[PDB]
Amino acid sequence: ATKAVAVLKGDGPVQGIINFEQKESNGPVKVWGSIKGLTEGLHGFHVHEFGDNTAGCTSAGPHFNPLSRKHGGPKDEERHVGDLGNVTADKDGVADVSIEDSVISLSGDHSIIGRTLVVHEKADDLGKGGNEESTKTGNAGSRLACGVIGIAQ
Amino acid sequence: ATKAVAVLKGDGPVQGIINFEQKESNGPVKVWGSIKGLTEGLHGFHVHEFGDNTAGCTSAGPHFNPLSRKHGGPKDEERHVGDLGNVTADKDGVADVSIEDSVISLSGDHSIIGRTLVVHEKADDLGKGGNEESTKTGNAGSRLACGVIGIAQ
Numbered sequence A, B: 001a002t003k004a005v006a007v008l009k010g011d012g013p014v015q016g017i018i019n020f021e022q023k024e025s026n027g028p029v030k031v032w033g034s035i036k037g038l039t040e041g042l043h044g045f046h047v048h049e050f051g052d053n054t055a056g057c058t059s060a061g062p063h064f065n066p067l068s069r070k071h072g073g074p075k076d077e078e079r080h081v082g083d084l085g086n087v088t089a090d091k092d093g094v095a096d097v098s099i100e101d102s103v104i105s106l107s108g109d110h111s112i113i114g115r116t117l118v119v120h121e122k123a124d125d126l127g128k129g130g131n132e133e134s135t136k137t138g139n140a141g142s143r144l145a146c147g148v149i150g151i152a153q
Ligand SMILES: [Zn+2]
Pocket: A046, A063, A070, A071, A072, A079, A080, A082, A083, A136, A137
C-alpha cells in the first residue's frame, strides 16, 4: 500500500533505486528496485544506523547491530537488521533486486524511514569469509553510492 | 530535540548536505550544513512533498503547491508550504547553510522528516522575474544533486 523511497546516488551513471511496499505500518515489506552503474556479479547492500551519510566515511561505519549479531542473511542465519541481501548486477550495468521480509516495517524515525542504505564495491561473504573484518561488513569492499529513505505515498 | 542530515548527490563531486534541530515540534527551526561542488555565486534550494525522488520527474516534479500557490518568499508574499529560497557558494565550491524558518519543523512525514530536497546550479527568481517558469518552479535555471532527508536524532 504505502511505498517508501530510497534514493541512492553516487556519480553520474551510478544510482540505486529501491521501493518498500508496505500494507499497514508494522507488518512485513515487499522490496524491489534497480542498482545501476555496477560491474557484473554481487555487491553488498546494507541499511545503516541513522540517516547521516554526509561526513563521507565519518558517518556510517559498518552496519548497525540493534539485535546484537554479526553480518549475514542469504547464507548466515544471525544477520543484522541493517542487511537487505546483496545486489547482483548484470553486464548492462544493473542489479534489479526483488525481496520480501519481516525484520523491518515503515515505522517511525528509526525503522527504515529516516535511515541510510549503502551499496558496496565487490561481492559480499554474508557471515564469516576468510578474515575477521568479513564478520563486521561482509568484506563487501568500499562504498560507491549512498542514499537516505523517505515516504513515497 | 531531533537532528536531521539530508544527503543529495548525483552530479559527480556535487553534494547537498543540510541538517536541522527541533527545539519544540511546533516552533521555528534552524537549518544548517553545506552544498559543495558548485561554482561561485547563487544556487536555488527546495524541499518537495514526499521523499520521492528516484529517477527524476516520475518521482516528483516542482516543489508542491498544497495551498495552490505561486513560488517565492524572500522577495514574494506567496511561498509554497514546502520550499526555501536560494543559497550562494564561495570559490572553494561550497555554500554554507545556516538559515531560520518559521513554517517547516521535524514532525510528521510531510514536514521535512520523511520529505525530499533538490538544489539548483543557478540563482532562484522567487515567484516572479520574467516568465511562466518563475511562477511555476522558481526559474532556477539548472539542476544539480538531489536527495532524501535523513535523521541522526
Ligand atoms: Zn550487515
